C-alpha cells in the first residue's frame, strides 16, 4: 500500500538485477463486488481493523513500469503485456 515500501523494494532488488513494478489498478468497487471470501464485508463491519481500501490507505503508484486493470483485460492479455516489456528489454532472448 505504501510508496515508501515499494521504493525500498525497488532499491533493494536493483542492487542485484532488474525490478518491475506492475500496478494491478483494478478499481476497489470491482474488488469488493467480486470478493468471494467476505473479507471486504467483514472489514466494512469492523471485524478487521484498518483494512486497505476500507480503513487504511492505498498510495496509488506513480511511475509504475506497467499499469493493468483486471476488470478491463483478461489475464493472458495482462501476462502478455508483462511478457512484452521483458521481451523488449532483452530479458527473454529465448532458447
Amino acid at each position: 500500500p505504501y510508496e515508501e515500501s515499494r521504493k525500498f523494494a525497488r532499491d533493494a532488488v536493483s542492487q542485484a538485477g532488474s525490478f518491475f513494478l506492475v500496478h494491478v489498478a483494478t478499481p476497489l468497487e470491482h474488488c469488493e463486488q467480486s470478493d468471494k471470501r467476505g473479507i471486504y464485508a467483514a472489514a466494512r463491519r469492523g471485524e478487521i481493523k484498518g483494512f486497505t481500501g476500507v480503513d487504511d490507505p492505498y498510495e496509488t503508484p506513480e511511475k509504475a513500469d506497467l499499469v493493468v486493470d483486471f476488470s478491463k483485460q483478461s489475464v493472458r492479455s495482462i501476462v502478455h503485456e508483462i511478457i512484452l516489456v521483458l521481451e523488449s528489454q532483452g530479458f527473454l532472448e529465448r532458447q
Binding site: S74, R76, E81
Partner: protein, 95 residues
C-alpha cells in the same frame, strides 16, 4: 443478365463454383474519370493500362453469396482469413 439476375462466379483454375452474385445493376464506368482521380491519371500507370486494355466496358454490381471457399494447394499453413488471424491473436493474448 439484368438487375435481379443470379449469376454463378466461376474459378478459371479449376471451374469450381465460388459465389452467386445477385445483381443490383449493370452500368458502364467512366474509365477516364476513374483512372484519373482514383489512380492519379497518367496514361502509363499499370492499373490504367489494365483498365483500358483488359477491363470490360461495363461493371456488374450486386451483393454476393458464398458457395465455396476457393482452392489453394500451396502453403495452407500460411493462408489466413481475417477470422483465423483474429482467433490466433486472441489465443496468444496479442493486443
Amino acid at each position: 443478365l439484368q438487375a435481379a439476375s443470379r449469376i454463378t462466379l466461376r474459378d478459371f483454375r479449376d471451374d469450381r463454383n465460388l459465389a452467386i452474385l445477385t445483381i443490383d445493376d449493370i452500368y458502364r464506368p467512366d474509365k477516364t474519370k476513374e483512372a484519373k482521380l482514383v489512380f492519379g491519371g497518367d496514361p502509363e500507370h499499370p492499373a490504367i493500362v489494365y483498365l483500358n486494355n483488359t477491363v470490360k466496358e461495363f461493371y456488374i454490381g450486386g451483393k454476393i453469396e458464398a458457395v465455396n471457399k476457393l482452392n489453394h494447394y500451396d502453403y495452407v499453413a500460411l493462408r489466413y482469413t481475417p477470422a483465423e488471424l483474429r482467433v490466433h491473436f486472441d489465443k496468444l493474448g496479442w493486443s
